[PDB]
Each structure stands twice: as structure tokens, then as C-alpha cells.
Amino acid sequence: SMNPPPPETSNPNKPKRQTNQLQYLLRVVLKTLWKHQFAWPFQQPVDAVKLNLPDYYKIIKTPMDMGTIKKRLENNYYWNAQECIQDFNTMFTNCYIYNKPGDDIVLMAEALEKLFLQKINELPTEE
Ligand SMILES: O=c1cc(N2CCOCC2)oc2c(-c3cccc4c3sc3ccccc34)cccc12
Ligand SMILES: [Cl-]
Ligand SMILES: [Cl-]
Ligand SMILES: [Cl-]
Known part of the structure; x- marks a missing residue:
């Protein structure tokens, strides 16, 4: 079963802003989780082809991963902390x-x- 396109990390039509909470989410939260010994599976999208999980996108309709979150933070994709915490x-x-x-x-x-x-x-x- 093929992988979908990854979640968008840029969208000129989406509103965004910098907030001190979003800065904290990048510089403190993402940074801390990213370096954990157990972070590696979460640093990129699930690859259902490599892992032989042909049902993955029949069960998980909203994939998300820290690679995507990292790019969203670095690219100023978010409007508020809640959007990022939700991811x-x-x-x-x-x-x-x-x-x-x-x-x-x-x-x-x-x-x-x-x-x-x-x-x-x-x-x-x-x-
Ligand atoms: O829900 C999940 C379920 C599973 N699996 C089901 C149980 O067996 C291991 C894979 O894996 C993952 C992984 C993951 C685990 C092991 C390897 C890799 C991933 S994502 C990825 C991307 C490229 C190369 C390797 C891997 C990450 C996040 C969530 C899941
Ligand atoms: Cl698929
Ligand atoms: Cl694919
Ligand atoms: Cl350890």
C-alpha cells in the first residue's frame, strides 16, 4: 500500500505568526524529544511500504511525525501553540x-x- 504525501509544511494561504510559546516548542520541546534514544522512529513519516504495514493508512487517517513538526516549526507554519501541541x-x-x-x-x-x-x-x- 503506497504512502500518502507527507503532511504539508508550507502553505501560503494558511495564517501564521511567531509566539514565545511556539519558540519554546521548537527550542525546548522538539529539541529535547528529538535527541532521546527512542526518538528515531518518530523523526520521519511512517513508511508503510518499508515496514510492510499495508493497512496503516486504513487505520491512521491523520499521520503525523516529528520530522513534519520540526519543519512546521522551522518554517513558521503554525498560528499558535495549540496547533503544534495537537500535532x-x-x-x-x-x-x-x-x-x-x-x-x-x-x-x-x-x-x-x-x-x-x-x-x-x-x-x-x-x-
Ligand atoms: O505506529 C507505528 C507502528 C510501527 N510498526 C508496527 C510494529 O512493528 C514495527 C513497525 O512503526 C512505527 C514507526 C517505525 C518503527 C520502526 C521503523 C520505522 C518506523 S517509521 C520509519 C520510517 C522509515 C524507516 C523506518 C521506520 C514509527 C512511528 C509509528 C509506528
Ligand atoms: Cl496506501
Ligand atoms: Cl509509496
Ligand atoms: Cl538511556
Whole structure:
């Protein structure tokens, strides 16, 4: 089953702005998760061809990954922190929906999510 185009990271018709929270999401949150030992599966879109998961896009209708998020942050795609936090949450929940509890990929997602929650609890107030 072929992979879809990845989620867009540019769109001149979409509104965007810089906020101190979005800066924090890039410089602190993404940076911290990206370097984790278990980050590598989440640094690019799921490749359902390489992994022989022909049902992946029958089950996961909103794919998301940190490569995409990183590009969205670096390219000033977002309007607010909520848009970016939603992408992270979609990434994690996709993994929990598709896989069995306790599978390695779920444990890896859970480790990143634990760090994510700590950093989101520490989200700065809007300037
Ligand atoms: O929900 C997911 C489910 C699964 N799998 C099902 C269980 O068996 C391992 C693959 O994998 C992933 C992966 C992932 C795991 C292992 C290798 C690779 C990926 S994504 C990718 C892209 C290019 C090359 C290799 C890999 C990442 C995020 C979510 C899932
Ligand atoms: Cl497909
Ligand atoms: Cl493909
Ligand atoms: Cl470690």
C-alpha cells in the first residue's frame, strides 16, 4: 500500500505568526524529544511500504511525525501553540491506536510523551 504525501509544511494561504510559546516548542520541546534514544522512529513519516504495514493508512487517517513538526516549526507554519501541541498528540495517539499496548513502539512513544508532558506543563505564559 503506497504512502500518502507527507503532511504539508508550507502553505501560503494558511495564517501564521511567531509566539514565545511556539519558540519554546521548537527550542525546548522538539529539541529535547528529538535527541532521546527512542526518538528515531518518530523523526520521519511512517513508511508503510518499508515496514510492510499495508493497512496503516486504513487505520491512521491523520499521520503525523516529528520530522513534519520540526519543519512546521522551522518554517513558521503554525498560528499558535495549540496547533503544534495537537500535532504531537496526534503522533502519540496514532501509535497507541495502531499498535498493541506494550509493543516496543508504544513504549518508545510513551517515553517521549512523558518528556513532552513535563515540558508542556512548563509552557511559558503568552507574552
Ligand atoms: O505506529 C507505528 C507502528 C510501527 N510498526 C508496527 C510494529 O512493528 C514495527 C513497525 O512503526 C512505527 C514507526 C517505525 C518503527 C520502526 C521503523 C520505522 C518506523 S517509521 C520509519 C520510517 C522509515 C524507516 C523506518 C521506520 C514509527 C512511528 C509509528 C509506528
Ligand atoms: Cl496506501
Ligand atoms: Cl509509496
Ligand atoms: Cl538511556
